[PDB]
Ligand SMILES: Nc1nc2c(ncn2[C@@H]2O[C@H](COP(=O)(O)O)[C@@H](O)[C@H]2O)c(=O)[nH]1
């Protein structure tokens with residue numbers, strides 16, 4: 001079912017270990033806020049927060065498509081004012097959702113707003129949103145694992161692999 | 167110096183979760199196992215647990231606030247005929263757990279069990295059956311590894327007791 | 333697109349003023365719980381038709397597959413432990429979105445539960461108390477009811493034609 | 495304990511404003527979308543829509559607080575390329591309405607204005623209001639959709655204390 005392993009568990013964990021310090025050094029009297037959209041990046045944000053050597057807090061959101069604009073099924077539980085926000089994504093490509101999210105959050109008057117992603121694809125050029133932190137640059141091929149799914153499966157994989165068309 | 171004593175090291179937690187996964191994996195062998203977690207104390211635990219379980223598992227989240235209790239974000243899929251494992255972080259009063267268990271059973275899943283990381287002594291009063299317990303601990307307010315005090319100390323890798331000054 | 337009208341404003345509003353009478357007799361304040369949004373137009377006129385002090389509690393609902401599972405989008409703002417609860421619905425077919433709610437509300441343990449519809453249909457699983465109109469298994473739109481979103485603002489209820 | 499606006503005054507005004515909006519929205523196959531916030535203005539919407547001749551469109555939203563507010567219930571449909579009328583119960587001090595504006599125009603509607611029933615005097619805030627039903631004074635008032643600790647909504651008239 002998994003054709004090939006794009007990134008092993010140890011490779012992923014070593015990269016996040018690097019990201020943690022890089023993020024930590026930049027944000028080094030309130031805690032850094034990690035904001036994640038359910039649920040492709042829960043494994044990533046749980047590892048990333050532990051990798052960040054400065055105190056960090058969690059906030060989750062749940063959105064849905066309308067069928068560039070998304071429906072909010074679950075909003076933030078806290079006001080964002082004067083807080084350093086770090087949006088945490090799993091995969092960014094033709095992601096207009098991220099574009100919408102950055103605008104929706106900056107309207108709430110954060111003190112800062114950056115974006116960190118584990119995976120970036122070549123089609124992320126067509127998105128209007130800056131990304132300060134990128135784990136890996138991968139091809140456009142459909143990958144699953146480490147939070148990434150295909151019909152809600154393969155999320156529990158600890159590595160990132162490529163699907164065979166089945 | 168916010169933490170007085172350390173209760174459970176990162177090694178103890180990791181080693182325990184590896185055992186649970188094995189135990190859970192052996193008990194669940196014929197769809198996929200369904201892990202349901204209520205936001206957001208048991209997010210770190212459920213991300214580490216799923217990876218420890220040697221059978222295919224899926225994630226499902228439910229955000230909920232108190233008034234018995236209010237639903238802010240229901241499940242993203244019907245759980246009819248599914249083997250459901252409720253994943254909690256800490257149980258003592260267990261009033262919310264008791265409701266959640268009843269609310270899920272009324273959706274008629276094939277199987278329903280509960281797995282918690284910590285269990286405090288006051289959990290003997292609540293009439294909820296728990297199939298898997300990571301650790302039994304005294305009746306002290308602990309923090310770390312998902313657990314919070316005013317949204318802080320969740321990103322800690324270990325579990326400790328909070329100093330009286332805080 | 334209404335082929336013909338069988339129920340109009342004067343006929344509906346009068347019955348709704350008659351429904352409130354029965355409710356006033358049979359019934360601190362009364363809670364009207366309604367599912368958005370095909371029955372919103374009916375509740376609003378019902379509360380004013382009831383002499384005793386009533387109240388509103390709204391509840392948004394989506395769905396999964398079909399056969400009677402229900403996803404919750406909003407749900408009540410308050411608890412209803414031991415209180416006057418009257419479910420207000422718009423249409424009742426062989427659909428069990430109604431008692432899923434009553435079961436969902438019974439579990440919260442109110443004092444009294446009672447349902448109430450404007451228009452019932454030849455299909456019936458719960459204690460349906462106060463029935464407004466008994467209509468055949470035909471098309472129904474108007475007065476809150478809809479077909480893809482529209483025909484809600486109508487003061488009457490007409491029949492669509494396929 | 496007081497009477498500000500009679501049920502006759504309220505019902506007569508709504509009909510006259512339904513006339514105001516009925517002939518100002520008359521090219522597009524879409525309808526006028528009535529977007530409102532629970533749970534105060536929910537009685538106005540039912541009477542306002544029937545007062546408006548052109549086919550209209552109900553849409554609701556639930557909002558909590560922390561003008562910073564939180565969405566508990568969102569819109570079912572996207573309002574892109576749509577004529578939207580925001581209907582509010584009472585407009586006073588809260589930047590709740592200004593937020594709803596800056597939030598809905600980001601959905602890029604074809605047109606966006608607001609129709610409120612009552613109007614407090616300090617509602618000179620943000621985004622000016624297209625249509626007004628009654629210019630009320632600066633006093634806490636209930637009745638007709640308005641409430642105090644969840645009540646007096648069943649009233650068909652508007653009265654103080
Ligand atoms: N599993 C997986 N999901 C992806 C990948 N790239 C983007 N996604 C996410 O999965 C979605 C696929 O659904 P669609 O693009 O058809 O709406 C994307 O919109 C994005 O949210 C990927 O490489 N693997």
Ligand SMILES: Nc1nc2c(ncn2[C@@H]2O[C@H](COP(=O)(O)O)[C@@H](O)[C@H]2O)c(=O)[nH]1
Pocket residue numbers: 256257258306307308309313314315
């Ligand atoms: N962080 C932390 N949370 C706890 C502990 N014991 C109970 N809780 C959680 O705290 C909540 C109840 O506390 P309350 O909000 O009523 O003071 C429940 O969500 C419960 O699971 C604990 O020892 N540490």
Ligand SMILES: Nc1nc2c(ncn2[C@@H]2O[C@H](COP(=O)(O)O)[C@@H](O)[C@H]2O)c(=O)[nH]1
Pocket residue numbers: 423424425427429470471472473477478479
């Ligand atoms: N508007 C309208 N709704 C109906 C009628 N009969 C039943 N309903 C309700 O509306 C649902 C149909 O909406 P749909 O599932 O097509 O979005 C039914 O499952 C039932 O809950 C009717 O005659 N007219």
Ligand SMILES: Nc1nc2c(ncn2[C@@H]2O[C@H](COP(=O)(O)O)[C@@H](O)[C@H]2O)c(=O)[nH]1
Pocket residue numbers: 584586588633634635636637640641642
């Ligand atoms: N009944 C009534 N409610 C009002 C009036 N003005 C504002 N409100 C509502 O009462 C709420 C009071 O909370 P606030 O936002 O003022 O802290 C407002 O947000 C608004 O929803 C009024 O004149 N009469």
Ligand SMILES: [Mg+2]
Pocket residue numbers: 037040041089090091
């Ligand atoms: Mg994503």
Ligand SMILES: [Mg+2]
Pocket residue numbers: 040148149150
């Ligand atoms: Mg996906």
Ligand SMILES: [Mg+2]
Pocket residue numbers: 204205206207208254255256
């Ligand atoms: Mg919990």
Ligand SMILES: [Mg+2]
Pocket residue numbers: 207313314315316317
């Ligand atoms: Mg907590």
Ligand SMILES: [Mg+2]
Pocket residue numbers: 367370371421422423
């Ligand atoms: Mg209905």
Ligand SMILES: [Mg+2]
Pocket residue numbers: 370477478479
């Ligand atoms: Mg309908």
Ligand SMILES: [Mg+2]
Pocket residue numbers: 534582583584
């Ligand atoms: Mg208001």
Ligand SMILES: [Mg+2]
Pocket residue numbers: 640641642643
């Ligand atoms: Mg109020």
